[PDB]
Design a protein around this ligand. Structure first.
Ligand code: MG
Ligand code: MG
Ligand code: MG
Lengths: 434, 232, 87, 141, 297, 137, 165, 323, 142
RNA sequence: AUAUAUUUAAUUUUUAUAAUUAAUAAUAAUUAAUAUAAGUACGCAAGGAUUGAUUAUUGAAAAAAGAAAGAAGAAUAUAAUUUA
């Protein structure tokens, strides 16, 4: 595909909101630094510029400073304040002792994804009443297959992950040889994910669906439906009738006489040809539901792909000037999800291994928000309550009866279904049809 | 518990509708003689006055079974304490002819409708702002700063609506008489014939009805809306 | 995380050299003192930009910069705090 | 010439339809339906068309500032047993309004209950004729 | 259970947050089709370069003073304000993000010198409650005993930073007396030194003081003595501002006022109680002049 | 091939040869029996104030080959229960949520008694980023 | 052919009024039952019923696009096509043919799929007359109002309506 | 362990106000701890009290030089902290009021800045601090009414008959360690201070550094401003006859005293008395600021005593500002 | 809920798989019953061999099935062979069902009532022990 | 009303694996409904702004390294749903 058309001006891109605070390299002197500006001085940091060891190299108006009381006092007070009030100068602790490599970094760490299979389509309703036509994808056997890094350069390290275990007689001889040299089980398809060296996983690592979190945003890549050779009315319809969008020289006023016409078909001209069967990518699709027993992930969107298509799933690094993985929203399973040793998915049921996302909307999309509706009835007793300043607690008269009521409530709340099921099973096993 | 205006509540309510006919709602104890008399009376088969006999019988059975109330149970009802508080606020503002109507049983969007008569746009806006400040505890928005209509103001307070009008516009609308004359909702009303404005070769529909409300006044419509549907 | 009061109010981006001190009682704006004195809120925006080419000279201590002695050795000025080329 | 519309990469050309026996799709659908049932968004149903169509349905839709309460007969059903794609076609006629609703199952805001417990095919035919006449009448002429 | 703020609570209050995933508005991701290869979660780190990550193997770039290969050339400002190893790419190639390989070496922080080990220093609490014109704001913050001049008689070290003020008048509160010796006869050629000293005497008579006549004195030297000024402070120390060729009355006032600030700092360190600066009739007259200037322009 | 195409076709092998010649100096050490990884200096000067008195931070990250090999070879630890059970939040809470309603003063209309802990509307609108020294959300 | 040098389309102002969608395979209107955002808006010269107690019976739409999705942010002017005749004789009765009022849309015959998945096919196209201040000329509404009516843009319309769906 | 304890005591600052247990216990009483140029010193004294936990429920650092905490006539409000007693579990709600000022800002800030730019002497600041003792109903925890009555008759204080001895001794120790035992008082002491200020206003007043002017005001506090601020304090201390005292003091009050009376009536909650004061106030900057003090509908509702004829109509704000 | 990226029944390529998206699609008639299948290039339909019209195609199919039942085999060409094999399977299914409706349907389809009778006589006992695939198709090298 | 040449849009059929560069479709001078800043700032007064949010307008795109004369379905959507 690769586009290369005229484009649609409905989507209003806004790059002016996408520029950080401008900074010039020349403005990186000691008068602009937020912290005490330090000089390299070889093996030890210093507060003064380096003095040339040859006195002949000294400039006529250059001042070789060996002790500046202003800088000394400021640096001393700064260091002593940071040492004596850690909780008060906590934000200044990133100046020295930086976060070490290997740990997850909010602005640096990117991890690999997985390879799913478009399984089926369903419809699910949220708590607000919004319906979502969801596509359920299946992740049969995800496993790190290979590591790659061209010429050992920086930022060129990636990991190749396989999708589906297949027999030996399934692939071509060279693909079978690739998997033999890799030493991992022979997979059906394999996708490469560019990562950072702190997000590596050993070759052969089982990748669980819980690698993703039920509420995050993902980038998916698949192959759309093939429609064959179609016409200009089918693909980019209502266009291609005449040569449009041509910016050439012409006269705006009758003052002069000069024009430059068209003598060929310019590249990008919309005409008939192949339609579909192209690698299509969706960006920022939220995750809806994760079934980690059947290895299923639900996306609230419908695809233009066929059932059985291998879809590459990765994570969207940022959205609207904000990082996906952060302390406010949440942190990922970095580098990948590792199950606990005590877990046994064979003993769990399908209805148990389900993870749902928080609501993706703020109001019933059928109606309007509360600020736009004419009138509404606000009945939210268990959802939330913005009414602060709780009333004073009731004066207790007997700690004995108070603790009795509290323990009774705790015992009636705990083991509401598990104990009931265990008692029912014990009764069914002890009755023996009597 | 406190109401929407932070007022204690001492009067309970019914979660069902008053117009309902449910065995669970009926508290009178049955009698063998009454049952025998009712059986001897029903021994003579006679259809209901509604158009769809099957549908009318099924709807009456559903009503006396009470599943309609189990489906229409709504605990989001308003409170009369808020109506009384708005009444006191409007009385302090000296708003004449305060008329409150409960239309929870009737087909509407609000539980209570208040109607007040104010003399002038200044007084109308003052009363609207005072109702807003009385609802300041739970309100999410304020009223319009610029009056788009100098004779009518609408203030929503939960499921309670407040209309502030002048004498002329109030007498012209006559919404209080409308909502008073309007009978409560009856599930047997949907058993009538459908109506649709369509001119046929003889001005008669085989399965539908044709009624023109242009020749009828507002009060005539308010009084005969259900009457015409029940007759034809 | 949760809502924290630390993120409510923004702090000044003053530099280290232009700062007076790192004390918590001097972390606030410098004009706030006169604002409190005058009992009025000042909302003057964009006070001044640095320059197109902001260049500065090395400042010496308040007493040294005026009581520097004319002490010289072979071809260089000598001070308890500075060295420099002398002709 | 300067672009390409198709992709012949193995990852995209390959399909996984042959390995679908390792995935119980129908069981997952039934599990979703049972989850909806136990959460209370839908109730399990099993009927045929001849015994479902024509039954009055009481539908309460939670809408501000007051839920809308309608009574309308079943005109068609899309699934016999309970399913996440169950569907229900209902004709509801108010005092002067006639509408044809298609209520999906499992929505927490759209609580519809079938009450007749029986079919009433003759009532279905009557409501069908009423809706047809009303629909042909409503067009402006 | 403890309660916290949430999106539902803020909605009930009346505020809705912006949509993150499901929205028909732009999601502000300029790198989806422009940046190729590996992209880092830091947003907009390549927008000033032109929204691309190509041509990163380059070493030298077009750069002004203080950027790039300027380190090999001498500039008076940057030679003392920038380390020759902290020179990066200049222009639009500013490094908002940098990634390198190898073992990171974190050099030890600098050490405060001329501080004896085992010395407990005095800590000065600086706050905005103290007026900025007070020398305490300019005094050292971490002050040791090895920095206190005891030969002068000080209990604390002297201030290291001086106020940056262009002095246009004299403040004779911390000055015991001012004697100005001039020659009676006027030099044949235009004597800028004599003119400047006469202007200095005029401004000292008009200086800021309740009665500057009690402290300013003029003398004539028939011995052809060069015109000079002698300021005796409250402690008895004398200062003689050198009046050289080209110096103006404003320059002499600046010198005298800077030395007066230094002398008052010495007094305060020795323990002398000095009268503070405040509002007076001279300041009211200066306010009249200031209003005149403001009304003019 | 165009001008830039020909230039890159000729020079990319030469760039890789230059990188090999650079790594030759690093391999010089390993042949001496003493292997020392590349030693890059830490940057203590990554916090700045621009011309418009705005805070700027330079993010410099250094990759450790030893940690990279450790992650390539060893197995990652078990995921945290809260990490894999708690869902990712779909909305971003404002740093300074405007409340507009506080039950502290006896008379709610009195503006001069509102507590200063509650953020103002200007704060609610302008605080779209952590405070000046802070860098993480 | 203006401009003389590079002639352009003379429908530049019509493009600012119409809501069009290129009929490719990815962009299609379809029927309203496909989902949310699949109903074709009402074009111009479309007849609607007038259910308020006014002299008018039918109106003709002037708007190039009219739908429920943007009934809260767009103004719909219309002209009174047919007016009821009163053989035996206020502001609502003074409605004369040819006059231009605004219209609040209540229902449509085309399929409308809500975001909750509830499709609806009303009996007939419906609207009520309003002035430039969005105050209905009638005192009562003889039909059902759609859910989109529940918006502050239609305050008086919601007040005068007695049934919503 | 110590690091976590310190960080919890620090995050006590970041704790929110809406979720603070301010009304956790039924009974409450108010006390005035004096006026402080720098109330942060008194706050540090309260923080370092042996009878209170080092981890408070809520802490607010009072920084008068912050753009959101600059004290004005219509000041930012109240900085609030909440401490817990160790032995009785009572609550101390410390309230630093930054809105008690009754001095108008300078008309021309440039002249005031030129005047006070190089001055090396600044006047004191009068910023009030109050404490609300919150305690539950107790019969044997306060040591009976006689113990507190003995404490009151010994130290000239006004404590309730059931206030916990823990909180009583905590307040006493804090005030004595800070050195404001004379400033620590209650309703009776505030009434005595108000009588003293009335006598001082009757007596001739000494000349300050320079007379006040709408252009360049004098930062030093005068007797009338002190009287207004102390009327505000007496209203804050929950005086039962505060409305009667304001009504009796209004006819003989100056402009700052009337501004203080307006603020005091607004604190007490008498909207009718506040509207009466605003309508009786002659037009000027004082009336403009006392109108800006509150959240209103229209300024004429407060300013106009009699209804001003607007478009042959008359508005009435008595129902809006009654009760 | 929203709509798929491509709404409505859109004709895809010959070898394109299913989409499995909510789409209101109707069948011409019940093609699940034997001899009532539809012809097309999707996978749910029989490969439509070349004919002037669907009526002509059905006539060719009827004569093919008639001769198939007549002489137990048939040499056909092109896309007619899969259709003939599937229709022979359908005929065997109808014969094994042996209902009066099945008799009448095979009589409606076939051109020879004697061949209808021959099928219903022979095929049940012939394929009683077979589940499916009653006909064998062999591609010839000529 | 013509594909003859040029030029374009496609294709040369699993290529385990987009990305070191060439070239190339979306660089805000938006519009309308609400609500909040606020019934604030600003006005003699009646009055009354600026303003980052939701809808409204419904879309998503990766180039070249493997063995080739059937239907890429043994065809009635299963990689053989029993099978003589
Ligand atoms: Mg909506
Ligand atoms: Mg009409
Ligand atoms: Mg090939």
């Amino acid at each position: 595909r690769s586009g290369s058309g005229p484009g649609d001006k409905r989507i209003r891109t806004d790059w002016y909101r996408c520029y950080p605070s401008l900074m010039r390299e020349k403005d990186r002197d000691m008068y602009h630094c937020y912290y005490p500006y330090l000089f390299d001085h070889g093996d030890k940091m210093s507060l003064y510029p380096k003095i040339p060891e040859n006195p002949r190299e000294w400039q006529p108006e250059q001042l070789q400073t060996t002790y500046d009381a202003i800088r000394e006092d400021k640096y001393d007070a700064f260091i002593r304040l940071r040492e004596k009030f850690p909780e008060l100068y906590q934000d200044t602790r990133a100046w020295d002792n930086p976060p070490p490599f290997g740990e997850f970094n909010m602005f640096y760490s990117v991890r690999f994804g997985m390879v799913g299979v478009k399984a089926f389509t369903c419809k699910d309703y949220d708590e607000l009443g919004n319906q979502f036509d969801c596509t359920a994808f299946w992740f049969p056997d995800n496993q790190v297959v290979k590591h790659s890094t061209r010429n050992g350069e920086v930022g060129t390290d990636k990991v190749y992950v396989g999708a589906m275990n297949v027999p030996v007689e399934f692939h071509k001889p060279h693909v079978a040889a690739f998997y033999k040299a890799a030493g991992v089980p022979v997979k059906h398809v394999c996708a490469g994910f560019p990562i950072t060296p702190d997000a590596y996983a050993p070759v052969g690592t089982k990748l669980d669906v819980r690698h993703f979190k039920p509420g995050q945003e993902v980038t998916i890549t698949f192959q759309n439906t093939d429609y064959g050779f179609r016409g200009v009315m089918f693909r980019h319809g209502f266009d291609g009738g005449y040569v449009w969008l041509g910016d050439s020289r012409w006269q705006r006023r009758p003052g002069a006489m000069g024009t430059e016409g068209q003598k060929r078909i310019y590249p990008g001209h919309r005409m008939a040809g192949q339609t579909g069967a192209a690698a299509e990518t969706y960006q920022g699709v939220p995750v809806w539901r994760i079934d980690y027993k059947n290895s299923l992930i639900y996306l609230p969107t419908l695809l233009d792909a066929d059932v059985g298509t291998y879809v590459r799933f990765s994570d969207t690094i940022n959205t609207k000037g904000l990082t996906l993985w952060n302390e406010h929203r949440g942190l990922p399973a970095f580098p990948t999800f590792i199950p606990p040793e005590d877990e046994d998915l064979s003993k769990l049921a399908t209805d148990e291994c389900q993870l749902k996302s928080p609501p993706l909307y703020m109001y019933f999309r059928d109606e309007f928000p509360a600020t736009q509706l004419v009138s509404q009835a606000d009945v939210e007793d268990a959802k939330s309550a913005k009414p602060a300043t709780a009333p004073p607690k009731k004066k207790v008269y007997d700690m004995k009866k108070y603790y009795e009521a509290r323990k009774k409530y705790r015992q009636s709340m705990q083991k509401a279904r598990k104990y009931k099921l265990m008692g029912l099973r014990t009764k069914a096993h002890e009755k023996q049809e009597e | 518990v406190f109401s929407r205006l932070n007022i204690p509540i001492s009067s309970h309510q019914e979660e069902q509708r008053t117009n309902s006919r449910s065995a669970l709602r009926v508290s009178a104890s049955d009698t063998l003689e009454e049952t025998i008399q009712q059986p001897t009376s029903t021994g003579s088969k006679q259809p209901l006055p509604y158009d769809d006999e099957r549908f009318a019988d099924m709807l009456l059975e559903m009503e006396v079974e009470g599943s309609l109330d189990e489906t229409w149970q709504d605990g989001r009802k308003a409170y009369i304490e808020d109506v009384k508080e708005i009444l006191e606020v409007l009385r302090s503002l000296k708003v004449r002819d305060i008329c409150a109507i409960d239309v929870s049983n009737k087909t509407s969007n609000f539980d209570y409708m208040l109607f007040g008569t104010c003399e002038g746009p200044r007084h109308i806006h003052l009363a609207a702002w005072a109702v807003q400040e009385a609802d300041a505890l739970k309100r999410v928005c304020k009223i319009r700063r610029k009056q788009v209509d100098h004779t009518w103001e609408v203030v929503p307070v939960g499921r309670i609506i407040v209309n502030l009008m002048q004498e002329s516009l109030r007498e012209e609308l006559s919404l209080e008489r409308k909502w008073a004359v309007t009978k409560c909702m009856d599930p047997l009303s949907v058993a009538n014939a459908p109506v649709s404005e369509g001119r046929s070769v003889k001005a008669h529909g085989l399965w539908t009805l044709t009624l023109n409300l242009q020749d009828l006044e507002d009060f005539e419509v308010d009084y005969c809306k259900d009457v015409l549907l029940t007759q034809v | 995380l949760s809502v924290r009061t630390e993120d409510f109010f923004s702090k000044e981006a003053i530099s280290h050299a232009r700062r007076v001190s790192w004390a918590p009682h001097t972390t606030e704006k410098k004009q706030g003192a006169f604002a409190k004195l005058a009992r009025s809120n000042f909302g003057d925006p964009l006070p001044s930009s640095f320059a197109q080419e902001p260049y500065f000279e090395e400042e010496i201590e308040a007493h040294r910069k005026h009581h520097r002695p004319d002490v010289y050795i072979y071809k260089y000025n000598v001070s308890p705090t500075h060295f420099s080329l002398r002709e | 010439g300067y672009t390409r519309e198709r992709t012949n990469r193995h990852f995209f050309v390959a399909r996984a339809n042959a390995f679908f026996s390792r995935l119980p799709i129908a069981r997952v659908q039934r599990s979703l339906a049972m989850e909806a049932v136990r959460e209370g968004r839908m109730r399990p149903w099993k009927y045929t068309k001849e015994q479902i169509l024509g039954a009055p349905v009481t539908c309460n839709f939670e809408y501000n500032p007051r839920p809308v309460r309608l009574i309308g007969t079943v005109m068609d059903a899309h699934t016999e047993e309970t399913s996440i794609k169950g569907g229900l076609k209902v004709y509801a006629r108010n005092e002067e309004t006639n509408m044809m609703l298609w209520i999906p199952p499992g929505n927490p805001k759209l609580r519809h209950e079938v009450t007749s417990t029986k079919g009433s095919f003759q009532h279905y035919l009557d409501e069908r004729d009423k809706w047809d006449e009303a629909w042909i009448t409503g067009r402006a002429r | 259970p403890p309660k916290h703020y949430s999106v539902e609570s803020l909605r009930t209050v009346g505020l809705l947050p912006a949509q993150l995933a499901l929205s028909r508005k732009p999601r502000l991701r300029p790198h989806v089709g422009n940046l190729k290869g590996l992209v880092y979660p830091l947003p907009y780190y390549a927008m000033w370069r032109g929204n691309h990550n190509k041509y990163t193997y380059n070493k030298s770039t077009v750069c002004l003073w203080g950027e790039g290969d300027t380190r090999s050339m001498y500039h008076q400002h940057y030679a003392h304000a920038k380390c020759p190893t902290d020179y990066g790419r200049g222009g639009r190639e500013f490094e908002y993000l940098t990634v390198k390989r190898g073992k990171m070496l974190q050099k030890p922080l600098p050490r405060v010198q001329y501080v004896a080990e085992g010395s407990k220093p005095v800590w000065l609490f600086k706050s905005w409650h103290t007026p900025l014109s007070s020398p305490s704001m300019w005094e050292r913050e971490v002050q040791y005993a090895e920095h206190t001049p005891e030969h002068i008689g000080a209990k604390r070290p002297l201030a290291v930073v001086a106020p940056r003020t262009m002095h246009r008048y004299l403040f004779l509160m911390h000055m015991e007396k001012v004697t100005i010796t001039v020659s009676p006869l006027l030099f044949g050629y235009g004597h800028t030194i004599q003119k400047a000293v006469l202007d200095f005497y005029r401004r000292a008579i008009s200086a800021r003081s309740p009665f500057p006549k009690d402290k300013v004195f003029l003398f004539y030297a028939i011995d052809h003595i060069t015109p000079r000024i002698e300021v005796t402070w409250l402690d008895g120390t004398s200062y003689v501002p050198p009046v050289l060729e080209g110096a103006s009355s404003q320059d002499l006032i600046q010198m005298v006022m800077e030395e007066a600030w230094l002398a008052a700092d010495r007094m305060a360190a020795e323990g002398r109680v000095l009268n503070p600066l405040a509002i007076d009739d001279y300041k009211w007259d200066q306010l009249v002049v200031f209003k005149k200037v403001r009304d003019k322009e | 091939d165009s001008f830039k195409e020909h230039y890159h076709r000729v020079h990319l092998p030469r760039r890789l040869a230059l990188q090999r010649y650079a790594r030759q100096q690093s391999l010089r050490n390993a042949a001496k029996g003493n292997v020392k990884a590349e030693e890059v200096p830490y940057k203590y000067n990554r916090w700045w104030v621009n011309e418009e008195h705005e805070f700027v931070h330079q993010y410099a990250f250094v990759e450790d080959p030893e940690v990279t090999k450790a992650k390539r070879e060893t197995l990652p630890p078990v995921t945290r229960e809260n990490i894999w059970k708690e869902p990712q939040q779909t909305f971003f809470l404002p740093f300074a949520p405007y409340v507009r309603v506080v039950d502290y003063p006896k008379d709610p209309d009195a503006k001069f008694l509102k507590p200063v802990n509650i953020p103002r509307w200007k704060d609610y609108m302008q605080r779209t980023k952590p405070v000046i020294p802070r860098t993480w959300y | 052919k203006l401009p003389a040098g590079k002639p352009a389309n003379k429908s530049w102002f019509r493009h600012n009024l119409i809501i069009r969608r290129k009929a490719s395979y990815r962009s299609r209107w379809g029927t309203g039952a496909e989902g949310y955002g699949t109903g074709v808006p009402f074009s111009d010269q479309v007849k609607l019923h007038c259910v308020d107690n006014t002299n008018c019976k039918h109106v003709r739409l002037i708007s190039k696009a009219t739908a429920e999705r943007f009934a809260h942010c767009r103004v719909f002017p219309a002209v009174a096509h047919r007016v009821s005749v009163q053989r035996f004789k206020v502001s609502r009765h003074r409605v004369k043919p040819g006059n231009i009022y605004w219209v609040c849309l209540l229902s449509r015959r085309q399929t409308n799929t809500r975001m909750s998945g509830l499709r609806t096919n009303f009996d007939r196209n419906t609207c009520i007359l309003m002035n430039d201040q969005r105050v209905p000329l009638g005192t009562r509404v003889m039909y059902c109002a759609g859910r989109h009516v529940n918006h502050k843009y239609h305050l008086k319309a919601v007040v005068l309506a007695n049934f919503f769906v | 362990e110590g690091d976590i304890l310190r960080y919890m005591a620090y995050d006590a600052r970041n704790a929110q106000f809406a979720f603070a247990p301010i009304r956790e216990f039924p009974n409450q009483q108010e006390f005035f701890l004096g006026e402080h140029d720098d109330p942060e010193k008194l706050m540090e004294h309260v923080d370092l009290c042996p009878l209170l936990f080092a981890i408070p429920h809520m802490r607010t650092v009072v920084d008068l030089h912050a753009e959101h905490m600059i004290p004005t006539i219509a000041g930012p409000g109240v900085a609030t902290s909440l401490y817990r007693c160790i032995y009785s579990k009572a609550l101390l709600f410390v309230q630093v009021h930054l809105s008690s000022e009754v001095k108008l800002p300078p008309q021309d800030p440039e002249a005031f800045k030129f005047m006070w730019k190089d001055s090396q002497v600044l006047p004191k600041m009068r910023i009030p601090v109050f404490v609300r003792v919150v305690w539950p109903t107790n019969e044997r925890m306060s040591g009976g009414g006689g113990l507190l009555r003995r404490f009151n008759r010994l130290f000239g204080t006004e404590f309730a008959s059931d206030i916990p001895v823990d909180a009583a001794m905590a307040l006493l120790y804090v005030m004595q360690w800070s050195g404001h035992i004379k400033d620590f008082l209650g309703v009776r002491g505030m009434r005595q201070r108000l009588a003293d200020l009335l006598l001082a206003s009757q007596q001739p007043e000494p000349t300050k550094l320079y007379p006040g002017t709408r252009e360049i005001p004098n930062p030093e506090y005068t007797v009338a401003e002190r009287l207004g601020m102390h009327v505000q304090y007496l209203a804050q201390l929950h005086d039962p006859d505060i409305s009667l005292t304001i009504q009796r003091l209004l006819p003989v009050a100056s402009a700052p005293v009337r501004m203080g009376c307006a603020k005091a009536a607004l604190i007490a909650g008498d909207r009718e008395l506040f509207r009466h004061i605003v309508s009786s106030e002659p037009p000027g900057r004082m009336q403009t600021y006392m109108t800006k003090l509150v959240r209103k509908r229209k300024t004429r509702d407060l300013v106009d005593a009699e209804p001003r004829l607007l478009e042959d109509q008359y508005e009435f704000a008595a129902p809006l500002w009654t009760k | 809920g929203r709509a798929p990226p491509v709404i409505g029944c859109t004709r895809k390529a010959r070898y394109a798989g299913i989409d499995d998206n909510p789409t209101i699609t109707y069948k011409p008639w019940d093609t699940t019953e034997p001899l009532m299948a539809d012809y097309g290039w999707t996978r749910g339909k029989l490969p439509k061999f070349r004919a002037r019209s669907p009526f002509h195609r059905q006539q060719i199919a009827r004569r093919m099935v008639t001769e198939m039942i007549r002489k137990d085999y048939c040499i056909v060409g092109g896309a007619r062979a899969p259709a003939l094999r599937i229709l022979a399977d359908h005929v065997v299914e109808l014969a094994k069902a042996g209902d009066t409706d099945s008799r009448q349907q095979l009589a409606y389809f076939l051109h020879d009532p004697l061949m209808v009778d021959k099928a219903f006589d022979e095929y049940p006992r012939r394929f009683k022990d077979m589940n499916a695939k009653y006909a064998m198709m062999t591609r010839l090298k000529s």
